[PDB]
Symmetry: D3
Subunit: 255 residues, 6 copies
């Protein structure tokens, strides 16, 4: 029973769909709490190996509920640690896939960037326009956008509020793949299926290793990866993976 989202399970794939169509899936505190609660529940479910987050064909998530912020003081925001709960999504250990159609603006752009894989429809429009409302990004946009697309384009988007289409996003580093709008959900599901049929521990360790690339020097990331790599050979799925390859068959991992 969620009020702002829909959750479905199909095999080892969980799908969270934002469900505020009249508001173009704009994020509010309720969406934050529901999305993070569902994602965390899915993350702890051993029968789920990949999580998709998506919106509608018109909008993945177009901005935020401004009435919830308009009257905040610094003290209000600091005491609430406003938006901190979104960190629960980045903390999810299972691979997450943002399937982005139409508007992914402000908080919606930031939500997409929090996921590991980002599959965009050719209709995807990305932006961080809230400078127009007298504030800066507050859900990590200044950090993740910049790391994805570089300073020049991040500054342009964040200081002007201009939109970036799917093609620009794909050649700039923001998205994994662009697909036709009509195929977005099919393609996202296909990718989620592939990832969910990997070893759960291997896919988690791989994700963890990639995430280290933003948290330390290359020298420390290399050491971390190697130690993780060594540990993957303390697992049963590695031996099954190698058997399947030799026998030219599909692996049957126990996760």
């Amino acid at each position: 029973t969620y009020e702002t989202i829909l959750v479905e399970r199909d095999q080892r794939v969980g799908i969270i769909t934002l469900n505020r169509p009249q508001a173009l899936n704009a994020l509010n505190s309720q969406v934050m709490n529901e999305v993070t609660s569902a994602a965390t529940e899915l993350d702890d479910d051993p029968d789920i190996g990949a999580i998709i987050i998506t919106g509608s064909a018109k909008a993945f998530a177009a901005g935020a509920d401004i009435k919830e912020m308009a009257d905040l003081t610094f003290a209000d925001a600091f005491t609430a640690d406003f938006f901190a709960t979104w960190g629960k999504l980045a903390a999810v250990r299972t691979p997450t896939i943002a399937a982005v159609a139409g508007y992914a603006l402000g908080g919606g752009c930031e939500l997409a960037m929090m996921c590991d894989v980002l599959i965009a429809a050719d209709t995807a429009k990305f932006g961080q326009p809230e400078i127009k409302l007298g504030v800066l990004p507050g859900m990590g946009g200044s950090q993740r956008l910049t790391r994805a697309i570089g300073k020049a384009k991040a500054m342009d988007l964040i200081l002007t509020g201009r939109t970036m289409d799917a093609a620009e996003a794909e050649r700039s580093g923001l998205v994994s793949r662009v697909v036709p709008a009509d195929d977005l959900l099919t393609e996202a599901r296909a990718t989620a299926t592939t990832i969910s049929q990997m070893s759960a521990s291997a896919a988690r360790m791989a994700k963890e290793a990639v995430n280290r690339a933003f948290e330390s020097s290359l020298s420390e990331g290399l050491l971390y990866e190697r130690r993780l790599f060594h540990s993957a050979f303390a697992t049963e799925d590695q031996s099954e993976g190698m058997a399947a390859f030799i026998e030219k068959r599909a692996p049957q991992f126990t996760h």
Copy 2:
């Protein structure tokens, strides 16, 4: 009255134009001192919300004055802290826009990369060729180029001295937008106007937050941004910006 640059102010936009046409705007010590002095002055002017740096249609800046460096010893360079003063431009709090036409080579490329936004003419040509003079980049090119375009291309440019055209620069991460050469100054001024009409507080905070992305772990950058975002709720412009949006009217920012 500067010797090597021209400075103009219109509304909330300041424009610094490199002006050594006899040398295709090659950078020297005087250009460094004047550009930084002018940018710092504009930064402290409350009636300026954006700063453009640009050169000519032939060259943003084509390298450096080599005679100023040819005879230097290590002691000379270390004592002078040669090039350190360019750090004053990075320290400017107001958003800066590089409008790059023609050659942006060596120091010129590094100057363009110091700015926040980079709008390039389709004529723009970028490079870091001073390996051919027996030195490496000294104005941050090895750091900013690599972060913008990745190791493989940065190494290629820096070790071979090859130029990169505007199309390659744009798909590689170095430039914000490419526009036709005839429209460069018009487009740059339009972008600067847009930025200068934003809340000065919000724009300063947004720029500062973006800059943190290169200075610490993602985890620390995220905390910094969130706290700066919380601070924004103590500003008049946060209240007015959101009120104006809710009330379907134009915001009247006061820059506080």
Copy 3:
């Protein structure tokens, strides 16, 4: 005498060619030891200024031998520090160029990423497919890929095992330049020649500076580069390089 590679010297260019056609140039512990040994020997040779690593037209390197990995436990892997020796290649001070044709998959992709410059044939195919075997990258793939092409694409490649063609690799940050397959070795030799004819001191310093971009804050990288730049003024090649420019002649470098 090497069993798995060939080593050639042409003027100031060394070329290491992977030579296991029976295994599509799959890497193993022997290839690791031989490549790193050869590269280190070339690195210490004052008559070499650039090093090319390459495979065949069909494969740069298609992966790693499975046999070796299934054989050991964790305490054994930890005690052997399996794959750590590849770090010797990153420690090479002389510029390195990967000339990649055909498959560069898994360890092969990782090897190419260890080099400074990466020139790809239009036939090149990159990827990290070993997740399909329940096996993680152990040669820096999770680190260098992510830093080259960004999180979204790196997560996609590493979690799904999909390949990336040359055009995508070029527009994403992974490769320096794409050239026709028939021209790969010619183009790589030309690039290596160009780099090897630069000042050895300037090239080494430039490479070292670029590498700093992944190891510290931008602020520290800028300081490191500026100080290395200052040191360059103690070198003969700085003096000659700049004198030659001013006097309109070809520089005559001594690599000092």
Copy 4:
């Protein structure tokens, strides 16, 4: 209802007392879940301004239960992320004080180090002896000990398993203050009272700033602190605190 701890509230001070005398307050998964749950609940209570964690006169906490650790494999440890939940204690925003009497060994030493302030009885004994069981620190001991007392002493403690008495701990960086054993709880309550009667906003900001000192370069830490300091001028307690000082009266804080 807790099984392994007691929780008390006295004005603005919360006190969590480890209560497993039969095991010298050895930590286990149940103690981890209960301590973190209690601390989080206290952290979210606006009527609490400081949190004390303490054990008995004989032991703060003598280690961790061996039973739980021998029970699992690696894939199980990784899937459970064994000990990760202790991170909730580090995430507490309200100031925390460890009042340590007697044994604080292994996980017990690590728990004390997670707190902001550490007041030690003269009877306190610290150490990381689990290397003797072939077991590594898993609660941050290799990180916090080293940062507190330096490499030489941390390597000594962690590799040999030797204990460190209160005097050595105080002169080495591990503890805030040493007091007589009979006075520990009185002194800890007095310190907690003092902290809890400060502005809740100022105390939280100060703690957060100090914590930054271990997460980034000094340059970034200085910037973070200065900006948090700037934000403090949006708080009522800054206004009242400074007004009270100027008017020579006791400040009357509202924790806003």
Copy 5:
């Protein structure tokens, strides 16, 4: 002619003496501007090799002028970048020595910590008490105190406002040496003289290298130091220093 400080030069030693005796040398905006201006001027003087900052026998500096802060909004503080100018003292390349007698509280403690060497009178009293005024440290105390004395003691000082005497400061990491109060200025001048008679290049490099220890990983700091050390071999003072040692004579440094 400064208002809040006195400046004296003798041989290669400059001395800045805080001079607000009516306020026990409490820091205000004017002190910040004058101290930084004077230090920057001394830094650029080739006949100065060391800079002392000191106050009176009663107080190095006892806090700050609170009236200047009491009425500030966040916007006021952010726009002013309140306290940022103190960064100019950290940017001084010449070695700085704080000679601390009596109270060094709040900003005064932070000022002492900005210097390279800290010589304390046995009368010295350190603290960071502005939590009692509803704010946290704003001049780097949360960063430098914590790095000097460790988390437990820094948290204790900053959250309670308690003072730390010279003995505790010296065994905790905050001060270089403690001397009798009557000998403080004599000892500070002797230390400054010793430092000022070293090669100015070598002393600048040594200080810069030490400062890197707080800005990056150990691995990066080690590379930086080694490269700066290599650069030293381009200096006349390296040649003369080592020649003088080998030849059993006094070095004649030229500061290049």
Copy 6:
């Protein structure tokens, strides 16, 4: 056959003793090469679990051979990467113990700081005096001294060249323990014996974890430690360690 050092093995302890008594064990290129070669050989020997480095009662190592540096140009030093080979000592995976009596000055101070554990005789005198020779530390002193004893004291030592006695070094963070001069070698051997009788892999992992505390943020060090911790339970020695404790006997690790 070494010219400047002596190497002995006793059970699982290797001992490297600097042997240039007429020069107060001053470091030169030969000592660097011999010490690093012996340490690396000992590190690869499965019958060695701890390595001691020591000098004489008068001097652990008093400075360096200045004639080897006096005539160097920047180009010479950069081309040689002068002193880089000392990095081989820090790269040793087995625990290293510096047993320091008398002078440990300049390079000798730096050599002591490169080791993991530092046991000092009460006669130990530490210093970094080479500012007097117109250079700064070149073997990591500016990095390791500062991290050990704090800025104020590191700056004092490095800018003035003053010496620091054993008592000051011990209360400042530089040394693990101070013992009487007559007991230095006995105490160092005792400590080395203790460490060498731990599980080889556990002692290596513990050392590795501690070393991370200087290479990244606390958040990243904590993650690294936990993953390492999890991996220690993929080893046989852990189970033996726990059996021995329960049975109140000495463990018999297989390393």
